[PDB]
Amino acid sequence: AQNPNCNIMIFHPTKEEFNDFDKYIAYMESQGAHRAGLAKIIPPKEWKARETYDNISEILIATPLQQVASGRAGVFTQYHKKKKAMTVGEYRHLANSKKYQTPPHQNFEDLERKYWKNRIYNSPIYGADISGSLFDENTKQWNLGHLGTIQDLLEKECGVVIEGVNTPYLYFGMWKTTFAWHTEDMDLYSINYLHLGEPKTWYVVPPEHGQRLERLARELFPGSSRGCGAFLRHKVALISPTVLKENGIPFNRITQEAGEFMVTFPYGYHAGFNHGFNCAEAINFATPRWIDYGKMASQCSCGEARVTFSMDAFVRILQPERYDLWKRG
Ligand SMILES: [NH3+]NC(=O)[C@H](NC(=O)CCCCc1ccccc1)c1nn[nH]n1
Ligand SMILES: [Cl-]
Ligand code: NI
Ligand SMILES: [Zn+2]
């Protein structure tokens, strides 16, 4: 069996290997990459997403989110407080201001220590799930605005057309901005390109051990757990690597830098934080291997779910028994 220890694997495709997205995802899985839940892909030197990032300051962040934490340093939740709209130029200035700028640090490890020591005592501002793309039209390889849609994948695999579209999202980050433990909607894959700026550190649990994380989360957030059988779908809960290790949860970590892709795999729980001002782009996608995960994916019905885009048709076709009551929610 490939990658039995579920290590995060890093791939360096040639320009020839970078032409067929589906084929390369399949290749990575043939080497066991999905067992980790997360893989890094470094594009060939000949490739670029766009020519320059000099003209992005006028993008609007319509609803910046101030991430206020409650709890303890290693076990906390965050609430996303809506702020006034601002441009990316204004956001970048704010991220670099004395209140929000990255502190001095020796290396990624030192910054990671500072993050988990001090995160809860600050409330950074985050731009999330902004429909849009920064890939040049003329970028033909791994352009997250030109992948095959999930609706087309479901039709190809299962035979029925469904409504819906599948478009990419932009994310604007600063130091300590945080993404809570989650899998993707309907346990889809995701792919994330870091366009510009400072790194993003990721934590991931192997899909085969995902239920171990869920059990710990129920123990650590018992009120939330009584309110919803799938409360990690709310995307507000954080657990530190130290607490995961204390509780024997298998996980791995890796830092993504500008110009690098990360792929998350079906039912791979992940969480992480940004090191400083950056801009990323991401989209969910599917493969034939996703179908059985979509059939089994947990759903939140309590009204608290954070869902990036409409999964109704996926639930309707893949989970007909659930459809009705999931829809009541
Ligand atoms: N799949 N997505 C990810 O892995 C990361 N983004 C998120 O999870 C979005 C977190 C927003 C959650 C939220 C917002 C408002 C109210 C409640 C919860 C990401 N961040 N940067 N790149 N990816
Ligand atoms: Cl700090
Ligand atoms: Ni994600
Ligand atoms: Zn819920």
Curated annotation (Swiss-Prot):
Keyword terms: ADP-ribosylation, Chromatin regulator, Dioxygenase, Iron, Metal-binding, Nucleus, Oxidoreductase, Transcription, Transcription regulation, Ubl conjugation, Zinc
Cofactor(s) the protein needs: Fe(2+)
Enzyme nomenclature, EC number: 1.14.11.66
Signal sequence region: none
Record flagged with keyword Ubl conjugation: yes
Binding site for Fe cation: 182, 184, 270
Residues reported to bind Zn(2+): 228, 234, 300, 302
Task of the protein: Histone demethylase that specifically demethylates 'Lys-9' of histone H3, thereby playing a central role in histone code. Does not demethylate histone H3 'Lys-4', H3 'Lys-27', H3 'Lys-36' nor H4 'Lys-20'. Demethylates both di- and trimethylated H3 'Lys-9' residue, while it has no activity on monomethylated residues. Demethylation of Lys residue generates formaldehyde and succinate.
Protein name: Lysine-specific demethylase 4D
Organism per entry: Homo sapiens
The gene coding this protein: KDM4D
Parent-protein residues present: 11 to 339 of 523
